[PDB]
Design a protein around this ligand. Structure first.
Ligand SMILES: Nc1ncnc2c1ncn2[C@@H]1O[C@H](COP(=O)(O)OP(=O)(O)OP(=O)(O)O)[C@@H](O)[C@H]1O
Ligand SMILES: Nc1ncnc2c1ncn2[C@@H]1O[C@H](COP(=O)(O)OP(=O)(O)O)[C@@H](O)[C@H]1O
Ligand SMILES: Nc1ncnc2c1ncn2[C@@H]1O[C@H](COP(=O)(O)OP(=O)(O)O)[C@@H](O)[C@H]1O
Ligand SMILES: Nc1ncnc2c1ncn2[C@@H]1O[C@H](COP(=O)(O)OP(=O)(O)O)[C@@H](O)[C@H]1O
Lengths: 143, 272, 1475
């Protein structure tokens, strides 16, 4: 059995794995955050297949990292939004998540420094308040 | 059996293609003072030792194929592991790409020994002064980070400053149009992945690999000034598998170019 | 009891029984308090020992109890242990509250009074003051940000930064001046933490952080202290990022602190997140990057204790499992060391255990099963698993991972350098770190080199100490001249880069080889340009060394002068003694080591006035249990070991030895077996632990040094726990040894003076040849160019030369004594000494080489020397000798012509004088008079053993005691033989070992010195013991750990070349003592003479044929020579042809001609050919080889003996038997076939009944086998294809000869002990009952090489000492007594009964070894091979006889492929089908 080699397949697998109740909680900005983290995990995973270029060595960016990242986002968003149905995009702890996914999760297995630089680059491109604009680009010049 | 004969043919061919012998470097107190000479003599000793090892092992194999003597235990392992095509342990003392097969290993080793013959002949012709202007290739040298550190030590000793207070600058130029400055060392064979550099300026492109005619390594004292946002740091790897890091170069990208986009596309420098 | 107070789950179950046993004993629980806690070394109690007053540490810092717990009201061990723990936590918290109140009072101040600040420091422990500083800084910064809550407010964070700056300035001034070392560590930890705080506050200021909830502040470790909380345990809350933890409130004593590398707090964040995420972390990476120390620093910062389970061969399971579940109860932490080093099954088991505990922990987010026990998992746990590149698949899902690839060494060096009060700390750090990066690569790699980060830490600490001693000296000088004393003033004008150069010189220069010195100087020039250092020469010590070397006759020099390198090495040794209390003078054998430390001790004694006492202990010679001490299984009584004994004797201060300087030199090899108990000494604790429970603090004067030759087996942990000095072989110059020997010879007389005068005259004569670029050194290097049987060590050869020159002096003295009227003059003495010196060079340099290389050495010397030499056109000088009259005379004249008695031909003890054996007689005399132990080397059977026995029996006053060194030889056997022949007597000097008989030098012969196996740490304990005796002139008696000198005793050994299997080359240390001489197989002319004597005595039996003795010897020698050059050992391992087989040849001829009275020459040559076939051809494995052998024997018989009838003399069926006739007459093959067929009818009728066909090979082989049985000690080697008839023919011969056949019944259950039982059975049957037995056994019967070795020793000795012990021994003696009583011999003691038993066995037991250099040449091999065409044809004919294979219609083909050569020309039908 092989996972289908696709960004779409990985996103679908991620959203199927994550329970429906968890991703819909009081903060309605949570769903955007969950989608962004899922897209980031999928882009990393599918970069693994191109090991000489996508990284420097095949890391085990397994599903456990995704569960840990989901728990981190859940708990920190619960911290920042104390039972509020909405939270402003600027109030999101963007730096906290950026540094956490840069050092603890998805970064621990990262051994080479330049892989860490890549992870920082992806995280700073994706995780920011600018994401909550309708004109955001998850990629540039796909074709 | 026939694999006796085919292995005999392969061993004969390898002994033909591998160069005969490697000359050692003559020791001298002034040469011992120079760090480049010490690095190069260490390299020559290692290369001559391993060349003697492989030459003797191939002579052993070819004589055994003719039956004049019997497979020992280590010989049994060596013949079996030549037939199976996987690289022997006793031959690999320097870092190698994981999947490299014996045949292109021998081709690479022939290349390395030829370059070592070149540098030994150049050293014998003159001295460490002529040793300074040699255009070595990082992939060819067994320990190239030793070479870059030796260049650092050479410039520090020649011009009398601390090693910590020194930094490296890159001047990617054509081999013909290059200047041999006292701080400049010629490095060849460097290749970029996913970028093209013109006049020390980088541009993203879809070309898979761009060859540098000659990379110029110059050591300049630490300027203590913050790097411009247009300058990017490129990792340098020995092999395409990029499992080992040698050193880091700093490159200035072109206008309109996003250093984040250099990072995402995995732009890198490869020795081989 | 185990459930209550689970903290003693870490100590052993045997130690648990101990604490139960010592329940009413508080003073014996000290080991357990050490093991169970972090830094707790003892609990403080009153004189009543009824209440605990405080808790101390390994350093000595103590914590006083707020409410002491009295054991009287809580007699139960668990109850008062729990009370001690809880009250320790309570007092730690309350003392923290007091210290934090103090520090906040000090804080928020424009300036700090230094006096009050150090008073606060000393008022509390190191950990408490560190934690108080952290808490105060945390509260100050948090309040400063809470003021920032208005947004854009002017920052009082500048005030916090300035407060930290001024406190850091105060510490920078304070650490500088001399302080108590515990205060020193307190100051170092505080300055480290405050440097970290200053950097993090600078980052916060740069980032312009505004809100207290900004993640930029959340990331850093925040300390929250609320004294208002009732429970003191959680009054301190530790919080980093989202994680929040309570303080462990456990006492750590003093622990090394890290430097808060960005890598380090990266790890901090990742760990704490993982624990809040309720899973452990796995910070993998290469070793030496601080992974385990990072985990320890996390545990310490939270105040919990970490367990460092080191995972190597020392790792265990049951103790590991119990300490693991103890961790489970207690809640402390545990950091596994390198996890990939575990073996696979162990790795899986421990992985399953940790997976169980991890899932329990995640469940708690609660009991789990450990050792069938449900255990409440405490929330506070963490478990960490470092790794060296992966995780087992059962834990990849449960554990995080980190990249510990490279810690910031720059930051570490900057923090620790500044922690030592260095100004310009960052400059020196950024210089020194790349310097060690350079050292780890450019320096030639060595086993002992260690340029890891730990070496950097050590260099920094040493540099700080050097700066302090320099400022102390400056302060003393300024007090002397003037009074203006200011620490800041002297500090400012104090260079610091010179200080680091000095420190690195004093720590790393000793460890370099002679070539790395210019490399390190170049590196210093490149990293620290313009700055250089020179060690301050200690002129007092220089003069004391010069004077002592003058007294000890050693050579002295300064720098470039001869021995100057050795002098510098001695100075570095002194320096590192001043710094380090533990040493290893690592270097090749005989470099400088023993005499360097001796001369240093004596120079220090004469300079300081503190007398020096040494306890030179060899660790390997004694067993480890005896080295440290024994544990009584019943009464646990403490029998101290040697080192523990001497330590306690020094401690007791009985005779002022505390005032004396004590040097416990550990001469010998080192391995991680005994030093594991001694590693607790070489650290800063300086305390010796014992298994019984006693502890001994190391007095300051005691200095432990290790005198080890190589560190290929030393654990790097122990290598780094103490200093090092390298003594390269270049340090010891050759001419330096020459001067040593010349001075010693000129000084001391040999007996214990006229002979001193003759020594001085001899030295004057010989001096020119021992100058630099002299004859001896060129000859020595030439001998180094050649090869030698044993490992050529230069000191060995020089010692041999010096010993033989001393013997030349003794010979001159004896000649003067025999000629009192005419003492030798200067000219004659001069000639004698020159020629003796040339002779000694020849026999000492080439004495371990083949004859050809001896000739080459003689040729080289003749080319280079000027001494007159014999003018022999071909004979090499080595075959010549020098007369006592100083003339060159051939050795052949010294060889007499013995006429051995005709019944003593080829006897085991008849030595025939030959050139080689008289030369070796002279060398043995020379080398035993000097009492220099020696070893014989040469191919087995060359005659060395008896070439020595003849000398030593010819020696007037030396008993020979041969000993058979086996693979399992232990020095216990040497002790046994010593107590058997020698006795211990108490002299005023001390206990003395002396042989019982007087005036009689006991020589101990060792047949095969190299046979005992090399340990896995490359040391032969026996050879170490003899090295200890020969060097030290004594040994240590383990019964009372007393130095016992050896008197009137010397050792001699022998061994074949090490290239033979089972032969381990000896340690160069032991070689440098014993000179070795090569005894090869005798040459052609030597063989001619040696067996010409044997045959001339042989043929006296039959006078009519005496005239044919010498041509017979010539033919025998020629045939053996051919069989030499043709049958090399390369073709087959057993193609070895020694003069032992010549002795067997002549012995067989003797056994043939003895009962007989008359034969012509034809019968003689038939006998001669028979024996030649039985020796030289019966072992051949190829048929063309045996055809060649037959051709050669016939040709030699023709050429030497022309006038003899060929057909009768060598009739092809050469078969000799004694069964048909009364004597051993040549036997007709057909008639012998008839007789053996009749005996086969008898055999079939009585014994096994299977058909046996009698083809020629069966006849020849049955005759050979019976011939071997009929002799005593007949042991035979039946190599041949399976089924070919080996065992059946052997059984048939055994039944024919009346022998009882015995095969061992072998199966997979059959282990070594069943084999030993069968061995005792067969031995007692064949030696006690006088029941002859044939013992057959196969390769299928040998399931272990131990079987082979036991058989080896049984056949070499005739008996095995290892079979019969204890009850079995007593029963054997009972049976031997009964057997001797039946036989007619009255013997009482066990020794003579044992000898008679051995004689009976060697005369009655016959073992045969059947397969398909030790056993070879000592047994008889016979190659059956496979049945030839003939044998197959007869087998077919005999078996295909019942059925009618007869066809009258058969038509003979025109062509027959004639497979059977002897097929009848008309092949009948049966003949054709059999073919
Ligand atoms: N300074 C010196 N002057 C004269 N002779 C010396 C000097 N130093 C060493 N020797 C000689 O060199 C030899 C070394 O002796 P020693 O047994 O002390 O060496 P070592 O290095 O301890 O050897 P080992 O490893 O075998 O124990 C001895 O013959 C000793 O007399
Ligand atoms: N953060 C640090 N601060 C100070 N010294 C360190 C630090 N990390 C490592 N070291 C030094 O480096 C060495 C590494 O020790 P260790 O923890 O055994 O490494 P590893 O965990 O990789 O085996 C130690 O001897 C220590 O002196
Ligand atoms: N000069 C000699 N005199 C008597 N026998 C000799 C002589 N040289 C060799 N031999 C024979 O060679 C053998 C020598 O080997 P041996 O001394 O037994 O060696 P090891 O005792 O070490 O086994 C003896 O059996 C002996 O018969
Ligand atoms: N000369 C012979 N004539 C007849 N049978 C023989 C002869 N030699 C061997 N055998 C047969 O070989 C069988 C076993 O031989 P064995 O002594 O076990 O050979 P090995 O000892 O080499 O295994 C016996 O059953 C015997 O019948």
């Amino acid at each position: 059995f092989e996972p289908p080699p696709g960004v779409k397949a990985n996103m679908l697998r991620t959203f199927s794995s994550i329970p429906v109740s968890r991703i819909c909680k009081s903060p309605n900005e949570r769903a955007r955050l969950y989608f962004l983290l899922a897209w980031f995990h999928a882009i990393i995973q599918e970069r693994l297949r191109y090991a000489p270029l996508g990284w420097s060595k095949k890391y085990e960016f397994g599903e456990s990292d995704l569960r840990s990242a989901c728990d981190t986002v859940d708990t920190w968003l619960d911290d920042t939004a104390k039972g509020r149905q909405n939270i402003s995009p600027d109030k999101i702890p963007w730096s906290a998540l950026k540094t956490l996914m840069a050092q603890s999760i998805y970064g621990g297995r990262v051994d080479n420094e330049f892989d860490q630089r890549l992870l920082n680059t992806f995280l700073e491109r994706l995780f920011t308040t600018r994401s909550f604009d309708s004109e955001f680009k998850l990629a540039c010049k796909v074709d | 059996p026939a694999w006796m004969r085919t292995l005999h043919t392969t061993a004969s061919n390898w002994l033909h293609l591998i160069p005969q012998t490697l000359s050692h470097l003559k020791r001298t107190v002034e040469n011992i003072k120079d760090p480049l000479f010490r690095f190069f003599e260490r390299e020559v000793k290692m290369g001559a030792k391993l060349l003697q090892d492989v030459r003797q092992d191939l002579a052993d194999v070819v004589q055994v194929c003719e039956g004049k003597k019997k497979q020992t235990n280590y010989l049994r392992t060596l013949i079996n592991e030549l037939v199976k095509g996987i690289l022997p342990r006793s031959w690999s003392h320097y870092t190698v790409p994981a999947g490299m097969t014996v045949i292109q290993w021998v081709s690479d080793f022939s290349e390395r020994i030829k370059q070592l013959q070149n540098i030994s002949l150049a050293a014998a012709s003159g001295g460490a002064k002529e040793l300074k202007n040699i255009h070595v290739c990082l992939g060819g040298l067994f320990v190239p980070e030793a070479y870059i550190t030796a260049t650092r030590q050479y410039v520090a000793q020649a011009n009398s400053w601390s090693l910590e207070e020194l930094c490296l600058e890159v001047n990617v130029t054509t081999s013909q149009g290059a200047t041999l400055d006292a701080c400049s060392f010629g490095v060849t064979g460097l290749k970029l992945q996913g970028a093209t550099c013109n006049n020390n300026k980088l541009s993203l492109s879809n070309a898979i690999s761009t060859a540098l005619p000659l990379t110029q390594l110059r050591w300049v004292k630490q300027t203590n000034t913050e790097k411009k946002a247009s300058v990017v740091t490129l990792p340098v790897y020995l092999n395409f598998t990029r499992a080992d890091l040698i050193f880091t170069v700093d490159f200035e990208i072109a206008t309109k170019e996003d250093p984040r986009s250099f990072y995402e596309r995995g732009v890198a420098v490869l020795c081989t | 009891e185990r459930s209550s107070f689970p903290r003693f789950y870490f100590v052993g179950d045997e130690d648990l029984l101990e604490i139960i046993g010592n329940s009413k004993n508080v003073a014996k629980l000290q080991k357990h308090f050490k093991k169970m806690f972090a830094g707790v070394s003892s609990i403080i109690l009153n004189e009543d020992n009824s209440v605990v007053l405080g808790i101390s540490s390994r350093e000595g810092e103590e914590v006083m109890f707020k409410t002491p717990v009295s054991i009287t009201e809580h007699p139960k061990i668990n109850e008062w242990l729990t009370l001690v723990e809880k009250e320790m936590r309570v007092t730690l918290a309350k003392l923290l509250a007091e210290s934090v109140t103090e520090v906040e009072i000090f804080g928020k101040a424009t300036s700090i009074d230094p006096n009050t600040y150090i008073t606060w420091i000393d008022k509390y422990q190191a950990q408490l003051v560190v934690l108080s500083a952290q808490i105060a800084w945390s509260e100050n910064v948090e309040t400063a940000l809470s003021s920032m809550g208005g947004g854009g407010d002017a920052a009082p964070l500048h005030s916090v930064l300035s407060n930290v700056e001024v406190t850091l300035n105060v510490l920078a001034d304070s650490v500088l001046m001399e302080q108590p070392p515990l205060r020193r560590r307190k100051l170092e930890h505080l300055i480290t933490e405050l440097v970290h705080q200053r950097d993090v506050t600078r980052s916060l200021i740069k980032s312009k952080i505004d809100n207290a909830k900004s993640f930029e502040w959340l990331s850093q470790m925040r300390f929250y202290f609320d004294p208002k909380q009732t429970d003191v345990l959680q009054q301190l809350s530790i919080q980093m990022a989202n994680a929040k933890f309570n303080y462990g409130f456990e006492y750590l004593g003093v622990q090394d602190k890290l430097v808060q590398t960005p890598l380090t707090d990266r790890c901090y964040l990742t760990m704490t997140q993982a624990l809040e995420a309720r899973l452990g972390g796995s910070p993998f990476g290469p070793a030496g990057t601080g992974k385990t120390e990072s985990v320890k620093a996390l545990g310490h910062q939270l105040g919990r204790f970490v367990l460092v389970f080191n995972c190597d061969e020392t790792f265990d399971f049951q103790a590991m499992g119990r300490i693991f579940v103890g961790l489970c109860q207690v809640g402390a932490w545990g950091c596994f060391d390198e996890f990939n080093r575990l073996e696979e099954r162990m790795l899986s088991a421990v992985s399953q255990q940790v997976q169980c505990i991890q899932e329990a922990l995640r469940e708690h987010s609660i009991t789990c099963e450990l050792l069938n026990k449900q255990v409440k998992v405490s929330p506070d746990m963490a478990i960490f698993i470092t790794m060296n590149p992966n995780l087992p698949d059962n834990l990849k899902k449960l554990f995080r991972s980190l990249a510990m690839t490279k810690p910031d060494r720059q930051l570490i060096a900057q923090v620790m350098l500044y922690s030592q009060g260095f100004r310009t700390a960052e400059v020196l750090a950024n210089k020194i770190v790349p310097f060690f990066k350079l050292c780890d690569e450019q320096l030639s790699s060595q086993s002992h080199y260690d340029f890891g980060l730990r070496a950097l830490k050590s260099v920094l600490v040493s540099a700080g100490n050097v700066k302090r001693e320099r400022i102390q000296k400056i302060k003393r000088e300024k007090e002397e001249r003037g009074e203006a004393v200011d620490e800041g003033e002297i500090a400012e004008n104090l260079p610091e880069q010179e200080i680091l150069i000095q420190s690195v010189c004093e720590t790393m220069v000793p460890k370099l080889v002679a070539e790395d010195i210019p490399l390190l100087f170049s590196l210093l020039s490149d990293v620290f340009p313009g700055v250089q250092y020179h060690r301050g020469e200690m002129t007092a010590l220089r003069e004391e060394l010069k004077k002592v070397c003058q007294e000890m006759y050693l050579t002295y020099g300064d720098g470039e002068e001869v021995g100057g390198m050795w002098v510098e090495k001695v100075l570095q040794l002194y320096q590192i003694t001043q710094i380090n209390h533990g040493l290893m003078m690592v270097g090749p054998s005989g470099s400088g080591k023993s005499m360097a430390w001796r001369v240093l001790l004596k120079a220090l004694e004469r300079l300081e006035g503190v007398e020096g006492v040494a306890h030179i202990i060899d660790p390997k010679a004694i067993s480890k249990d005896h080295l440290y001490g024994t544990l009584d299984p019943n009464t646990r009584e403490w029998t101290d070991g040697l080192f523990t004994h001497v330590l306690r004797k020094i401690i007791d201060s009985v005779r002022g030895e505390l005032q004396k300087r004590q040097w416990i030199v550990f001469d010998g090899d080192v391995d991680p077996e005994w030093v594991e108990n001694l590693n607790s000494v070489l650290d800063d604790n300086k305390l010796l632990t014992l298994p019984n429970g006693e502890r001994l603090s190391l007095p300051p004067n005691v200095r432990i040094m290790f005198e080890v030759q190589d560190l290929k087996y030393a654990t790097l942990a122990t290598v780094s726990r103490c200093g090092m000095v390298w003594f390269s072989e270049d340090v010891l110059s050759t001419d330096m040894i020459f001067n040593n020997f010349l001075a010693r010879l000129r000084s001391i007389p040999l007996d214990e003076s006229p002979m001193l005068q003759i020594q001085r005259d001899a030295a004057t004569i010989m001096q020119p040849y021992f100058t630099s670029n002299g004859l001896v050194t060129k000859a020595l290097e030439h001998a180094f160019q050649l090869e030698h049987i044993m490992d050529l060590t230069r000191l060995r050869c020089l010692g041999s030369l010096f010993s033989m020159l001393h013997q030349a002096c003794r010979n001159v003295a004896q000649y003067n004594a025999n000629h009192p009227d005419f003492p030798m003059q200067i000219e004659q003495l001069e000639r004698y000494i020159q020629r003796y010196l040339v002779y000694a060079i020849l026999w000492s340099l080439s004495g371990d080489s083949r004859l050809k290389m001896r000739a080459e050495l003689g040729e080289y010397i003749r080319r280079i020397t000027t001494v007159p030499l014999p003018t022999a056109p071909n004979i090499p000088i080595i075959d010549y000798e020098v007369s006592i009259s100083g003339e060159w005379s051939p050795w052949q004249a010294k060889v007499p012509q013995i006429e051995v008695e005709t019944h003593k031909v080829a006897a085991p003890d008849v030595v025939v004088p030959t050139l080689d054996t008289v030369r070796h007689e002279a060398l043995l005399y020379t080398w035993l008079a000097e009492h220099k132990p020696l070893v014989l080397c040469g191919p087995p059977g060359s005659g060395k053993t008896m070439t020595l026995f003849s000398a030593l029996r010819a020696l007037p006053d030396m008993e020979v005691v041969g000993l058979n060194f086996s693979s399992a030889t232990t020095p216990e056997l040497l002790l046994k033989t010593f107590d058997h022949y020698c006795e211990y007597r108490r002299t005023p000097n001390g206990v003395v070992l002396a042989p019982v008989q007087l005036g009689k030098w006991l020589v101990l012969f060792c047949d095969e010195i190299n046979l005992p196996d090399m340990d896995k740490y490359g040391t032969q304990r026996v050879i170490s013991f003899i090295r200890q005796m020969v060097e030290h002139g004594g040994f240590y008696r383990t019964s009372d750990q007393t130095w016992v000198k050896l008197e009137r005793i010397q050792f001699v050994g022998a061994c074949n070349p090490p290239t033979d299997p089972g032969r381990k080359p000896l340690s160069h240390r032991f070689l440098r003592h014993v000179p070795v001489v090569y005894v090869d197989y005798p040459g052609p002319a030597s063989l001619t003479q040696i067996y010409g004597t044997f045959n001339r005595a042989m043929l006296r039996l039959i006078p009519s044929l005496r005239t044919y003795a010498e041509p017979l010897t010539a033919a025998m020698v020629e045939f053996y020579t051919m069989s030499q050059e043709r049958f090399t050992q390369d073709t087959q391992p057993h193609y070895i042809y020694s003069p032992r087989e010549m002795t067997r040849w002549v012995r067989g001829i003797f056994e043939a001609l003895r009962p007989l009275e008359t034969l012509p020459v034809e019968g003689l040559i038939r006998i001669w050919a028979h024996e030649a076939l039985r020796l030289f051809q019966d072992r051949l494995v190829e048929d063309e080889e045996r055809r060649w052998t037959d051709e050669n024997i016939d040709t030699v018989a023709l050429k030497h003996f022309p006038n003899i009838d060929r057909e009768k003399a060598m009739s092809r069926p050469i078969l000799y038997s004694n069964w048909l006739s009364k004597d051993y007459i040549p036997v007709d093959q057909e008639e012998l076939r008839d007789y053996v067929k009749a005996r086969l009818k008898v055999f079939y009728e009585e014994e096994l009944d299977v058909p046996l066909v009698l083809f020629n090979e069966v006849l020849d082989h049955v005759l050979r086998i019976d011939r071997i049985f009929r002799q005593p000690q007949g042991h035979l080697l039946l190599i041949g294809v399976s089924g070919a008839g080996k065992t059946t023919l052997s059984r048939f011969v055994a039944w024919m000869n009346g022998l009882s056949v015995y095969q061992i019944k072998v199966h997979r259950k059959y282990t070594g002990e069943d084999f030993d039982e069968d061995l005792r059975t067969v031995l007692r049957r064949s030696g006690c009952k006088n029941e002859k037995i044939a013992f057959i056994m196969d390769e299928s019967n040998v399931l272990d090489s131990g079987f082979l070795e036991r058989m080896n020793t049984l056949l070499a000795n005739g008996e095995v000492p290892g079979l019969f012990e204890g009850d079995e021994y007593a029963t054997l003696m009972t049976q031997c007594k009964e057997g001797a009583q039946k036989e007619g011999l009255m013997l009482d003691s066990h020794e003579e009964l044992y000898k008679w038993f051995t004689s009976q066995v060697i005369r009655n037991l016959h073992v045969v070894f059947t397969m398909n250099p030790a056993l070879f040449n000592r047994c008889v091999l016979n190659w059956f091979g496979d049945w030839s065409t003939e044998a197959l044809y007869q087998v077919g004919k005999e078996f295909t006889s019942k059925m009618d294979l007869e066809k009258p219609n058969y038509i003979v083909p025109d062509y027959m492929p004639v497979v059977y050569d002897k097929l009848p020309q008309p092949p009948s039908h049966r003949e054709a089908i059999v073919n």
